[PDB]
Amino acid sequence: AKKVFKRLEKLFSKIQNDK
């Protein structure tokens, strides 16, 4: 569906790894 938007949220958790 057009709700890959959820995957975007998971990607955000990948950016908060260096923090």
Q: What is the dihedral of CA 9, 13, 15, 16, to 10 degrees?
A: 140
Residue with tokens 């709700």, as numbered in its chain: 3
Helix (H) or strand (E) holding 6: helix 5-15
d(CA 19, CA 4): 25
d(CA 16, CA 7): 15
Residue with tokens 């959820």, as numbered in its chain: 6
Q: How far is residue 2 from each of residues 6, 9, 11, 13, 17, measured CA to CA in Å?
A: 10, 14, 17, 21, 27
Residue with tokens 């569906």, as numbered in its chain: 1
Handedness of CA 2, 7, 8, 9 (dihedral sign): positive
d(CA 19, CA 10): 16
Query: Which backbone phi and psi does 18 adopt, to 5 degrees?
Result: -75, -30
Expt. technique: NMR
